[PDB]
Design a protein around this motif. Structure first.
Motif, PDB file in Angstrom:
ATOM      1  N   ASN A   1      12.424  98.712  84.797  1.00  0.00           N
ATOM      2  CA  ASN A   1      12.969  97.876  85.858  1.00  0.00           C
ATOM      3  C   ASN A   1      14.347  98.242  86.390  1.00  0.00           C
ATOM      4  OD1 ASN A   1      10.990  95.401  85.978  1.00  0.00           O
ATOM      5  ND2 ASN A   1      11.336  95.821  83.772  1.00  0.00           N
ATOM      6  N   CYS A   2      15.078  99.083  85.672  1.00  0.00           N
ATOM      7  CA  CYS A   2      16.514  99.274  85.947  1.00  0.00           C
ATOM      8  C   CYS A   2      16.919 100.739  86.175  1.00  0.00           C
ATOM      9  CB  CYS A   2      17.384  98.707  84.803  1.00  0.00           C
ATOM     10  SG  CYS A   2      16.829  97.112  84.145  1.00  0.00           S
TER      11      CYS A   2
ATOM     12  N   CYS B   1      18.063 102.718  89.481  1.00  0.00           N
ATOM     13  CA  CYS B   1      19.424 102.592  89.985  1.00  0.00           C
ATOM     14  C   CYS B   1      20.509 102.819  88.961  1.00  0.00           C
ATOM     15  CB  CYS B   1      19.618 101.240  90.648  1.00  0.00           C
ATOM     16  SG  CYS B   1      18.496 100.968  92.007  1.00  0.00           S
ATOM     17  N   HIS B   2      20.182 102.752  87.668  1.00  0.00           N
ATOM     18  CA  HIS B   2      21.158 102.786  86.600  1.00  0.00           C
ATOM     19  C   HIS B   2      20.858 103.831  85.502  1.00  0.00           C
ATOM     20  CE1 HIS B   2      23.343  99.168  87.950  1.00  0.00           C
ATOM     21  NE2 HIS B   2      22.232  98.467  87.877  1.00  0.00           N
TER      22      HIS B   2
ATOM     23  N   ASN C   1      25.512 104.011  88.401  1.00  0.00           N
ATOM     24  CA  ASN C   1      25.034 103.173  89.497  1.00  0.00           C
ATOM     25  C   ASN C   1      24.834 104.054  90.709  1.00  0.00           C
ATOM     26  OD1 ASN C   1      24.755 101.324  91.652  1.00  0.00           O
ATOM     27  ND2 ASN C   1      25.815  99.708  90.414  1.00  0.00           N
TER      28      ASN C   1
ATOM     29  N   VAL D   1      23.811 103.283  93.624  1.00  0.00           N
ATOM     30  CA  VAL D   1      24.004 102.597  94.911  1.00  0.00           C
ATOM     31  C   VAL D   1      25.494 102.324  95.173  1.00  0.00           C
ATOM     32  CG1 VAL D   1      23.357 100.554  96.209  1.00  0.00           C
ATOM     33  CG2 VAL D   1      21.709 101.545  94.614  1.00  0.00           C
ATOM     34  N   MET D   2      26.193 101.763  94.172  1.00  0.00           N
ATOM     35  CA  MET D   2      27.596 101.366  94.258  1.00  0.00           C
ATOM     36  C   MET D   2      28.260 102.034  93.065  1.00  0.00           C
ATOM     37  SD  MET D   2      29.440  97.714  94.375  1.00  0.00           S
ATOM     38  CE  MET D   2      29.452  97.825  96.165  1.00  0.00           C
TER      39      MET D   2
ATOM     40  N   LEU E   1      27.370 100.632  84.153  1.00  0.00           N
ATOM     41  CA  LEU E   1      27.081  99.854  82.952  1.00  0.00           C
ATOM     42  C   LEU E   1      27.870 100.350  81.760  1.00  0.00           C
ATOM     43  CD1 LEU E   1      23.223  99.474  83.364  1.00  0.00           C
ATOM     44  CD2 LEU E   1      25.084  98.227  84.513  1.00  0.00           C
TER      45      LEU E   1
ATOM     46  N   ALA F   1      33.977  99.793  83.164  1.00  0.00           N
ATOM     47  CA  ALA F   1      33.582  99.173  84.419  1.00  0.00           C
ATOM     48  C   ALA F   1      33.115  97.750  84.236  1.00  0.00           C
ATOM     49  CB  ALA F   1      32.505 100.010  85.103  1.00  0.00           C
ATOM     50  N   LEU F   2      32.349  97.490  83.205  1.00  0.00           N
ATOM     51  CA  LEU F   2      31.881  96.119  82.983  1.00  0.00           C
ATOM     52  C   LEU F   2      33.061  95.152  82.780  1.00  0.00           C
ATOM     53  CD1 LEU F   2      28.835  97.012  80.699  1.00  0.00           C
ATOM     54  CD2 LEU F   2      28.662  95.848  82.915  1.00  0.00           C
TER      55      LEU F   2
ATOM     56  N   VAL G   1      21.775  89.788  85.850  1.00  0.00           N
ATOM     57  CA  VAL G   1      20.387  90.229  85.933  1.00  0.00           C
ATOM     58  C   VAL G   1      19.503  89.119  86.514  1.00  0.00           C
ATOM     59  CG1 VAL G   1      18.358  90.973  84.576  1.00  0.00           C
ATOM     60  CG2 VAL G   1      20.648  92.002  84.193  1.00  0.00           C
TER      61      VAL G   1
ATOM     62  N   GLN H   1      23.485  90.281  92.643  1.00  0.00           N
ATOM     63  CA  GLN H   1      24.800  90.362  93.286  1.00  0.00           C
ATOM     64  C   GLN H   1      24.765  91.572  94.200  1.00  0.00           C
ATOM     65  OE1 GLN H   1      28.344  90.000  90.830  1.00  0.00           O
ATOM     66  NE2 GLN H   1      29.628  90.931  92.398  1.00  0.00           N
TER      67      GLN H   1
END
Ligand code: HEM
Length: 93
Positions: A13-14, A17-18, A23, A25-26, A31, A35-36, A58, A62
């Protein structure tokens, strides 16, 4: 929760993009542990644990991060939150 189960949820599922804990996209909102702590609501100011803060993100989404509430069980969300916390805190990515 079960971080190993969470690795499977992440793959399904992740990882589009990750992959690698990054990331696609951004690029700043990774993760990784630094950054977190900088960006993630709740975690960033110590009002939530990392697992709870990731579960909220999740579930609800956002920006271009989708909402998974209703697509994934509460167990899957808790497991993937446990997985991210473990991967980030242990610098496993
Ligand atoms: C259930 C699988 C997923 C999990 C566990 C997950 C987890 C997270 C977490 C914890 C953050 C916050 C990162 C930070 O603050 O540094 C985040 C942000 C983000 N994620 Fe995901 N993610 C998932 C799926 C996706 C997918 C499939 C995409 C791409 C379509 C994506 C795109 C993004 C974007 C763009 C952000 C930043 C949103 C913003 O604040 O502007 N994520 N994700």
């Amino acid at each position: 929760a079960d971080a190993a189960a969470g690795a499977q949820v992440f793959a399904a599922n992740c990882a589009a993009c990750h992959a690698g804990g990054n990331n696609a996209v951004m690029p700043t909102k990774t993760l990784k542990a630094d950054a977190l702590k900088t960006y993630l609501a709740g975690y960033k100011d110590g009002s939530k644990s990392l697992e709870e803060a990731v579960a909220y993100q999740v579930t609800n989404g956002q920006g271009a991060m989708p909402a998974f509430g209703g697509r994934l069980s509460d167990a899957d969300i808790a497991n993937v939150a446990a997985y991210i916390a473990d991967q980030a805190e242990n610098n496993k990515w």
